[PDB]
Amino acid sequence: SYNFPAVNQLKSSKDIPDPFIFMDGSKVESTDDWWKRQSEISCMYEYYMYGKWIDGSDDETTYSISGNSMTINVKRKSTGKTASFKAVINLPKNVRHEGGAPVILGMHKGISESTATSNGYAVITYDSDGMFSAPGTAQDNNQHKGAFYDLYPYGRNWDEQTGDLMAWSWGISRILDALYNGAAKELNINPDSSIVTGVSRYGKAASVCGAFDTRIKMCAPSCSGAGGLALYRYSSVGKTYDFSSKGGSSSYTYKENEPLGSLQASGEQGWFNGRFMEFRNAEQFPMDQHMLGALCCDPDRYLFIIGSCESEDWVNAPSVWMAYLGMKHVWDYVGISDHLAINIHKSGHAVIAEDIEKMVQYFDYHVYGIQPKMNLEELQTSVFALPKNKDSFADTFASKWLYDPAFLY
């Protein structure tokens, strides 16, 4: 449903919104109520932030493979229009999972592909470097040009506006369609064992992709920052942390975090929808990004958050950590606490080798029953949980929520 108030009619609050309160003020009182609230949250994100999700109901996908180059061809059934875009295949030399290799679907090249393939996982990414060459589905700008927009033009009404993050997500869905439609058998991939990942602006994209294409088994957004998984309402500027347990500095003080106006600037607004430009303060959002993450909460799915302690203060890892703490309430309420994971590594604005290694051990355990070598409890905490690094905010932000049981964190 999209019968939502205009932005200028929204109440403002500094509190982190309760995921368990519906827009109309009614309460989640059962897990069945949660599934309904999750659907509402999904619609709210379309309406206020990312644009209309295009779910593939109108798309017919075919493909071709030449060496490691994959061409994805899409026809929009109602209009007859066609578009195409390119992806890159990386297969493991040895498949070790019955039913085919798991597949990491990447928003761009350069996500530690060789670590994945050495561990038996396939990787298919857009033929994009994550910077100068954007995915073929949409150029990285505010003019909305590319294979997605050739089929779904960016128009004047809100339902006609789908931002670049959703355009990039749509192409991942079409790659997955091609896999189910024959490509997975050709490549010795299990298309049900799917992961989506990407970094920075493409980490925002990966979060959106997992939230909206619920077929993808694990969502793994890296260093996604503002408009990704960071809380809009939590600032870490001027806070000091001890990162020595991770090999970092024993007294590291964060500089600036990205603020709302930076997301609304010409170089970033294309990622969002037109309605997003109406917001003036973070306190106006009828959500915060723990709720975007919670769109991936499901008994058959997993969310694996990646971020960094040092050298990327703008993407606000402490606020991503706070959002993760909020998400823990939802995953615990549904009874699947271990389906939520987080790796705050020392540094690297990237998906680095240890991220892949830990993703593989985690996914192998939950999806295949393979016992891990590592202690998976390490993915259920971070350096921000050390008492000396704790903000009192962590213990109070959820205190008004309907579900705030003791000892979640």
Short mmCIF file of C-alpha atoms in Angstrom, two decimals:
data_model
loop_
_atom_site.label_atom_id
_atom_site.label_comp_id
_atom_site.label_asym_id
_atom_site.label_seq_id
_atom_site.Cartn_x
_atom_site.Cartn_y
_atom_site.Cartn_z
CA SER A 1 0.00 0.00 0.00
CA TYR A 2 1.20 3.53 -0.78
CA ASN A 3 -1.47 5.68 0.93
CA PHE A 4 1.22 7.54 2.84
CA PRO A 5 1.41 11.18 3.98
CA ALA A 6 3.37 13.80 2.08
CA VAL A 7 6.83 14.60 3.43
CA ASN A 8 5.77 18.06 4.61
CA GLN A 9 3.07 16.40 6.77
CA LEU A 10 5.47 14.09 8.63
CA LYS A 11 6.09 14.46 12.36
CA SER A 12 9.73 14.88 13.37
CA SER A 13 11.37 12.91 16.16
CA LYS A 14 14.92 12.36 17.38
CA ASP A 15 13.93 8.92 18.67
CA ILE A 16 14.91 5.86 16.65
CA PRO A 17 11.56 4.65 15.26
CA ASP A 18 10.13 1.43 16.69
CA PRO A 19 10.06 -1.27 13.98
CA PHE A 20 7.11 -2.80 15.86
CA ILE A 21 4.72 0.18 15.42
CA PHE A 22 2.81 0.45 12.14
CA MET A 23 2.40 3.78 10.38
CA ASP A 24 -1.17 4.14 11.66
CA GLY A 25 0.01 3.58 15.25
CA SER A 26 -1.20 -0.02 15.56
CA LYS A 27 1.11 -2.56 17.17
CA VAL A 28 2.90 -5.70 16.07
CA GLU A 29 1.54 -8.30 18.49
CA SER A 30 2.61 -11.54 16.76
CA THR A 31 5.11 -12.83 14.25
CA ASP A 32 2.31 -12.81 11.67
CA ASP A 33 1.90 -9.10 12.45
CA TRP A 34 5.63 -8.66 11.84
CA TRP A 35 5.39 -10.06 8.31
CA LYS A 36 2.65 -7.50 7.59
CA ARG A 37 4.76 -4.70 9.10
CA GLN A 38 7.74 -5.83 7.01
CA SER A 39 5.62 -5.44 3.87
CA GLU A 40 4.59 -1.93 4.98
CA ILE A 41 8.22 -0.95 5.65
CA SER A 42 9.12 -2.15 2.16
CA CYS A 43 6.44 0.09 0.63
CA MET A 44 7.57 3.05 2.78
CA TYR A 45 11.13 2.72 1.48
CA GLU A 46 9.84 2.76 -2.10
CA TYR A 47 7.67 5.80 -1.43
CA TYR A 48 10.03 7.99 0.60
CA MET A 49 13.57 7.01 -0.36
CA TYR A 50 14.44 4.69 -3.27
CA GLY A 51 11.52 4.75 -5.71
CA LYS A 52 9.17 2.17 -7.17
CA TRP A 53 10.62 -1.36 -7.05
CA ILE A 54 10.44 -3.14 -10.41
CA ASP A 55 10.07 -6.79 -9.39
CA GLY A 56 10.44 -8.56 -12.76
CA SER A 57 6.72 -9.28 -13.22
CA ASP A 58 7.05 -7.60 -16.66
CA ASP A 59 10.54 -8.91 -17.59
CA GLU A 60 11.60 -11.87 -19.74
CA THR A 61 15.31 -12.65 -19.49
CA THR A 62 17.65 -14.56 -21.81
CA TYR A 63 21.44 -14.75 -21.84
CA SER A 64 24.57 -15.76 -23.70
CA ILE A 65 28.03 -16.72 -22.43
CA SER A 66 31.33 -16.26 -24.28
CA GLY A 67 34.29 -17.20 -22.13
CA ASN A 68 33.96 -15.23 -18.89
CA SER A 69 31.69 -12.59 -20.49
CA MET A 70 27.94 -12.88 -19.89
CA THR A 71 25.34 -10.89 -21.83
CA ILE A 72 21.93 -10.45 -20.16
CA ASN A 73 19.05 -9.66 -22.52
CA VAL A 74 15.74 -8.42 -21.12
CA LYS A 75 12.41 -7.89 -22.87
CA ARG A 76 9.67 -5.91 -21.16
CA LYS A 77 6.65 -8.04 -22.02
CA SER A 78 3.94 -5.36 -22.03
CA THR A 79 5.85 -2.92 -24.23
CA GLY A 80 7.98 -5.24 -26.36
CA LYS A 81 11.10 -3.13 -25.72
CA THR A 82 14.46 -4.83 -25.21
CA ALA A 83 17.71 -3.92 -23.50
CA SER A 84 20.99 -5.66 -22.68
CA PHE A 85 23.91 -5.40 -20.29
CA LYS A 86 27.19 -7.15 -19.48
CA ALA A 87 28.46 -9.25 -16.55
CA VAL A 88 31.72 -11.06 -15.70
CA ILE A 89 31.93 -14.71 -14.61
CA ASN A 90 34.50 -16.07 -12.13
CA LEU A 91 34.21 -19.83 -11.52
CA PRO A 92 36.00 -21.96 -8.94
CA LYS A 93 38.44 -24.49 -10.33
CA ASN A 94 36.96 -27.11 -7.98
CA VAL A 95 33.28 -27.33 -7.02
CA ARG A 96 32.90 -28.84 -3.55
CA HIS A 97 29.17 -28.37 -2.85
CA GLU A 98 26.65 -30.93 -4.04
CA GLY A 99 24.21 -29.19 -6.37
CA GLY A 100 26.73 -26.66 -7.67
CA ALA A 101 28.84 -23.78 -6.43
CA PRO A 102 27.24 -20.99 -4.38
CA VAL A 103 27.28 -17.70 -6.28
CA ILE A 104 28.17 -14.20 -5.12
CA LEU A 105 26.37 -11.62 -7.28
CA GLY A 106 28.52 -8.47 -7.20
CA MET A 107 27.61 -4.88 -8.03
CA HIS A 108 31.12 -4.38 -9.47
CA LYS A 109 34.44 -6.07 -10.11
CA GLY A 110 37.08 -6.00 -7.39
CA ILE A 111 35.45 -7.73 -4.42
CA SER A 112 38.17 -10.31 -3.62
CA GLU A 113 36.92 -12.63 -6.38
CA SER A 114 40.00 -14.86 -6.18
CA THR A 115 39.41 -15.49 -2.47
CA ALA A 116 35.87 -16.61 -3.28
CA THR A 117 36.87 -18.90 -6.15
CA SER A 118 39.73 -20.43 -4.16
CA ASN A 119 37.08 -21.35 -1.56
CA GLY A 120 34.76 -22.95 -4.13
CA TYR A 121 32.31 -20.04 -4.62
CA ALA A 122 31.45 -18.58 -8.01
CA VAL A 123 31.28 -14.79 -8.48
CA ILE A 124 29.28 -13.01 -11.20
CA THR A 125 29.55 -9.22 -11.20
CA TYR A 126 28.47 -6.37 -13.38
CA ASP A 127 31.23 -5.44 -15.86
CA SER A 128 31.84 -2.33 -13.74
CA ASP A 129 34.84 -0.99 -11.82
CA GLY A 130 32.61 0.60 -9.15
CA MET A 131 33.63 4.14 -10.11
CA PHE A 132 34.45 5.37 -13.63
CA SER A 133 32.28 2.67 -15.29
CA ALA A 134 28.93 2.08 -13.61
CA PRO A 135 26.80 -1.06 -14.18
CA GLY A 136 25.26 -1.09 -17.64
CA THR A 137 21.75 -0.89 -16.16
CA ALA A 138 22.27 2.75 -15.09
CA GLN A 139 24.93 5.42 -15.39
CA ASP A 140 25.98 6.84 -12.02
CA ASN A 141 24.27 10.23 -12.40
CA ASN A 142 20.94 12.02 -11.95
CA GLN A 143 19.79 11.76 -15.60
CA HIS A 144 18.70 8.08 -15.40
CA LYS A 145 20.19 6.56 -18.53
CA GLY A 146 21.02 2.90 -19.13
CA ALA A 147 19.53 -0.53 -19.80
CA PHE A 148 17.05 -0.37 -16.91
CA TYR A 149 15.78 3.09 -17.91
CA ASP A 150 15.46 2.00 -21.55
CA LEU A 151 12.67 -0.30 -20.27
CA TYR A 152 11.41 1.67 -17.22
CA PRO A 153 11.82 5.39 -17.99
CA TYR A 154 12.18 7.81 -15.09
CA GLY A 155 8.98 9.86 -15.23
CA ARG A 156 7.03 12.52 -13.35
CA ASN A 157 4.81 10.65 -10.88
CA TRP A 158 6.40 8.95 -7.87
CA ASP A 159 5.47 5.48 -9.19
CA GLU A 160 7.32 6.33 -12.42
CA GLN A 161 10.55 7.14 -10.51
CA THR A 162 12.96 4.32 -9.66
CA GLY A 163 16.36 5.54 -8.43
CA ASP A 164 19.78 4.30 -9.51
CA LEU A 165 20.19 1.98 -6.50
CA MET A 166 17.04 0.10 -7.52
CA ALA A 167 18.09 0.14 -11.19
CA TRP A 168 21.35 -1.55 -10.18
CA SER A 169 19.40 -3.99 -7.99
CA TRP A 170 17.06 -4.82 -10.89
CA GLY A 171 20.00 -5.94 -13.02
CA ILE A 172 21.13 -8.33 -10.28
CA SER A 173 17.61 -9.79 -10.29
CA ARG A 174 17.87 -10.31 -14.06
CA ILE A 175 21.26 -12.04 -13.70
CA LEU A 176 19.60 -14.33 -11.16
CA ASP A 177 16.73 -14.94 -13.59
CA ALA A 178 19.28 -15.97 -16.24
CA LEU A 179 20.87 -18.35 -13.72
CA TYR A 180 17.51 -19.99 -12.98
CA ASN A 181 16.66 -20.00 -16.72
CA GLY A 182 19.66 -22.17 -17.66
CA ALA A 183 22.90 -20.33 -16.95
CA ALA A 184 23.41 -21.93 -13.53
CA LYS A 185 23.38 -25.43 -15.01
CA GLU A 186 25.86 -24.32 -17.69
CA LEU A 187 28.20 -22.83 -15.05
CA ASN A 188 27.81 -25.53 -12.36
CA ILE A 189 26.21 -23.05 -9.93
CA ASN A 190 23.41 -23.63 -7.44
CA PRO A 191 21.15 -20.60 -8.07
CA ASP A 192 19.36 -21.04 -4.73
CA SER A 193 22.69 -20.47 -2.91
CA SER A 194 22.84 -16.79 -3.80
CA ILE A 195 24.63 -13.84 -2.16
CA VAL A 196 24.59 -10.16 -3.18
CA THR A 197 27.43 -7.74 -2.34
CA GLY A 198 28.90 -4.36 -3.24
CA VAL A 199 30.89 -1.51 -1.69
CA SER A 200 30.08 2.08 -0.64
CA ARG A 201 27.45 3.51 -3.02
CA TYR A 202 27.17 -0.08 -4.30
CA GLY A 203 26.89 -1.24 -0.68
CA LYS A 204 23.80 0.96 -0.47
CA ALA A 205 22.73 -0.75 -3.70
CA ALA A 206 23.39 -4.22 -2.26
CA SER A 207 21.29 -3.41 0.84
CA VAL A 208 18.42 -2.29 -1.39
CA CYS A 209 18.86 -5.37 -3.62
CA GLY A 210 18.63 -7.84 -0.74
CA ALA A 211 15.73 -5.94 0.80
CA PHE A 212 13.63 -6.05 -2.38
CA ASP A 213 14.68 -9.24 -4.23
CA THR A 214 13.89 -11.65 -1.41
CA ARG A 215 15.02 -14.68 -3.45
CA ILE A 216 18.65 -13.80 -2.67
CA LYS A 217 19.69 -16.04 0.21
CA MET A 218 22.31 -13.75 1.83
CA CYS A 219 22.67 -9.97 1.57
CA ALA A 220 26.24 -8.74 2.24
CA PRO A 221 26.50 -4.93 1.95
CA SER A 222 29.97 -3.47 2.55
CA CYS A 223 30.79 -0.01 3.91
CA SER A 224 27.38 1.28 2.86
CA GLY A 225 27.23 4.40 5.09
CA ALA A 226 24.56 7.07 4.86
CA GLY A 227 21.49 5.98 2.91
CA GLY A 228 22.69 2.39 3.29
CA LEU A 229 22.71 0.74 6.73
CA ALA A 230 23.96 3.67 8.86
CA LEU A 231 21.32 5.26 11.08
CA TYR A 232 20.51 8.73 9.79
CA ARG A 233 20.03 9.79 13.42
CA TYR A 234 23.40 8.61 14.85
CA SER A 235 26.54 10.76 14.53
CA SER A 236 29.97 9.48 15.57
CA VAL A 237 31.84 12.73 14.79
CA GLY A 238 34.23 13.52 17.63
CA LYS A 239 33.85 10.12 19.30
CA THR A 240 37.07 8.31 20.25
CA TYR A 241 37.56 4.54 20.04
CA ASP A 242 40.18 1.98 21.04
CA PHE A 243 40.76 -0.16 17.94
CA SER A 244 43.94 -1.86 19.22
CA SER A 245 42.20 -5.26 19.51
CA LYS A 246 41.83 -5.09 15.70
CA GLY A 247 45.40 -3.86 15.15
CA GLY A 248 44.33 -0.23 14.81
CA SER A 249 45.04 2.82 16.93
CA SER A 250 44.42 2.77 20.70
CA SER A 251 42.79 6.24 20.50
CA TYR A 252 41.08 6.94 17.15
CA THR A 253 38.78 9.98 16.85
CA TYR A 254 36.19 10.05 14.07
CA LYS A 255 36.00 13.05 11.78
CA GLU A 256 32.88 13.95 9.82
CA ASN A 257 30.11 11.53 8.87
CA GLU A 258 28.15 12.00 5.66
CA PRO A 259 25.02 14.14 6.35
CA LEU A 260 21.61 14.19 4.65
CA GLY A 261 22.41 17.11 2.35
CA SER A 262 25.32 15.24 0.78
CA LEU A 263 22.94 12.47 -0.35
CA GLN A 264 20.70 15.16 -1.89
CA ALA A 265 23.53 16.81 -3.86
CA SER A 266 23.76 16.49 -7.65
CA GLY A 267 26.35 13.70 -7.49
CA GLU A 268 24.27 11.45 -5.20
CA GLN A 269 20.56 12.34 -5.58
CA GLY A 270 20.22 10.10 -8.64
CA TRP A 271 20.54 7.10 -6.31
CA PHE A 272 17.22 8.04 -4.60
CA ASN A 273 13.77 9.12 -5.82
CA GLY A 274 12.28 12.59 -6.25
CA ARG A 275 10.33 12.48 -2.98
CA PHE A 276 13.60 11.97 -1.06
CA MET A 277 14.56 15.54 -2.05
CA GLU A 278 11.67 16.91 0.04
CA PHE A 279 13.27 15.87 3.34
CA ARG A 280 15.06 18.59 5.30
CA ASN A 281 16.13 16.78 8.49
CA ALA A 282 16.92 13.18 9.42
CA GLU A 283 14.37 13.46 12.23
CA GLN A 284 11.56 13.58 9.63
CA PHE A 285 12.11 10.07 8.26
CA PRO A 286 9.31 7.70 9.39
CA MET A 287 12.00 5.00 9.57
CA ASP A 288 15.68 4.53 10.19
CA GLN A 289 18.05 2.11 8.55
CA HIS A 290 17.67 -0.72 11.05
CA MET A 291 14.34 -1.10 9.22
CA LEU A 292 15.99 -1.34 5.79
CA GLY A 293 18.18 -4.11 7.17
CA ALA A 294 15.11 -5.79 8.68
CA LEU A 295 13.67 -6.22 5.15
CA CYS A 296 16.19 -9.10 4.96
CA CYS A 297 14.92 -10.77 8.16
CA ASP A 298 13.46 -14.14 7.12
CA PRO A 299 13.87 -17.77 8.29
CA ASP A 300 15.39 -18.74 4.92
CA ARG A 301 17.69 -15.70 4.52
CA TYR A 302 20.72 -14.01 6.08
CA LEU A 303 22.17 -10.51 6.43
CA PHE A 304 25.98 -10.14 6.70
CA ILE A 305 27.08 -6.53 7.32
CA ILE A 306 30.65 -5.41 6.52
CA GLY A 307 32.34 -2.18 7.64
CA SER A 308 35.67 -0.70 8.76
CA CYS A 309 37.08 0.80 11.95
CA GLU A 310 39.56 3.24 10.42
CA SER A 311 40.22 5.51 7.44
CA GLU A 312 36.61 5.88 6.24
CA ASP A 313 34.87 8.01 8.87
CA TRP A 314 32.44 9.41 6.26
CA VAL A 315 30.62 6.05 6.03
CA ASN A 316 30.05 5.96 9.77
CA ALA A 317 30.70 2.38 10.88
CA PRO A 318 29.64 3.24 14.49
CA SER A 319 26.19 4.20 13.18
CA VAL A 320 25.99 0.99 11.11
CA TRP A 321 26.80 -0.86 14.35
CA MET A 322 23.94 0.97 16.08
CA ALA A 323 21.58 0.01 13.25
CA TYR A 324 22.72 -3.62 13.67
CA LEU A 325 21.88 -3.44 17.38
CA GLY A 326 18.39 -2.27 16.41
CA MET A 327 18.08 -5.12 13.90
CA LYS A 328 18.88 -7.62 16.67
CA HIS A 329 15.46 -6.87 18.20
CA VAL A 330 13.66 -7.94 15.01
CA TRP A 331 15.74 -11.07 14.39
CA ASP A 332 15.28 -12.14 18.03
CA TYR A 333 11.51 -11.53 17.92
CA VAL A 334 11.26 -13.86 14.88
CA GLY A 335 13.43 -16.46 16.62
CA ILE A 336 16.34 -16.44 14.14
CA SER A 337 19.00 -14.36 15.92
CA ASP A 338 21.92 -16.19 14.26
CA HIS A 339 20.70 -15.19 10.75
CA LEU A 340 22.15 -11.70 11.37
CA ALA A 341 25.94 -11.23 11.23
CA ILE A 342 28.47 -8.38 11.19
CA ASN A 343 32.19 -8.07 10.41
CA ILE A 344 33.73 -4.69 11.33
CA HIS A 345 37.27 -5.23 10.02
CA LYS A 346 40.22 -2.94 10.79
CA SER A 347 40.35 -1.08 7.47
CA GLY A 348 39.65 -1.39 3.76
CA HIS A 349 36.82 0.41 1.97
CA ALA A 350 36.13 -2.82 0.18
CA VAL A 351 35.20 -6.47 0.40
CA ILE A 352 38.58 -7.78 1.56
CA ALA A 353 39.94 -11.32 1.80
CA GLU A 354 38.85 -11.87 5.40
CA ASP A 355 35.31 -10.74 4.55
CA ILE A 356 35.00 -13.47 1.90
CA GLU A 357 36.62 -16.06 4.17
CA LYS A 358 34.17 -15.33 6.99
CA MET A 359 31.16 -15.11 4.63
CA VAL A 360 32.09 -18.56 3.29
CA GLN A 361 32.41 -20.16 6.73
CA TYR A 362 29.14 -18.57 7.85
CA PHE A 363 27.17 -19.49 4.71
CA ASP A 364 28.68 -23.00 4.56
CA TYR A 365 27.55 -23.62 8.15
CA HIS A 366 23.99 -22.27 7.89
CA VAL A 367 23.18 -23.44 4.37
CA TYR A 368 25.21 -26.68 4.16
CA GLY A 369 25.87 -27.75 7.76
CA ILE A 370 29.65 -27.57 7.26
CA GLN A 371 31.30 -27.02 10.64
CA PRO A 372 33.35 -23.79 10.65
CA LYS A 373 36.98 -23.47 11.64
CA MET A 374 36.41 -19.97 13.05
CA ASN A 375 34.25 -19.05 16.03
CA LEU A 376 31.07 -17.69 14.41
CA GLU A 377 30.33 -15.80 17.65
CA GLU A 378 32.88 -13.25 16.38
CA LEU A 379 30.25 -12.21 13.78
CA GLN A 380 27.73 -11.51 16.57
CA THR A 381 29.68 -8.61 18.12
CA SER A 382 32.36 -6.08 17.21
CA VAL A 383 35.01 -3.80 18.69
CA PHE A 384 32.22 -1.28 19.38
CA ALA A 385 30.81 -3.66 22.02
CA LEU A 386 33.85 -3.29 24.29
CA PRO A 387 32.67 -1.32 27.37
CA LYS A 388 35.36 1.33 26.87
CA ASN A 389 34.00 1.94 23.33
CA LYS A 390 30.29 1.87 24.27
CA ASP A 391 28.05 4.91 23.91
CA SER A 392 25.29 5.02 26.52
CA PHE A 393 23.07 5.58 23.45
CA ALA A 394 23.46 1.86 22.72
CA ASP A 395 21.55 0.89 25.87
CA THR A 396 18.81 3.54 25.62
CA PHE A 397 17.89 4.06 21.96
CA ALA A 398 15.44 1.13 21.91
CA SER A 399 14.02 1.66 25.41
CA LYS A 400 10.60 2.86 24.15
CA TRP A 401 10.18 -0.02 21.67
CA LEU A 402 7.49 -2.65 22.17
CA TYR A 403 10.11 -5.42 22.12
CA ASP A 404 13.20 -4.50 24.17
CA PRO A 405 14.17 -7.65 26.07
CA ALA A 406 17.23 -7.65 28.28
CA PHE A 407 20.55 -9.16 27.14
CA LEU A 408 20.20 -8.79 23.38
CA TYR A 409 23.49 -6.85 23.48
#
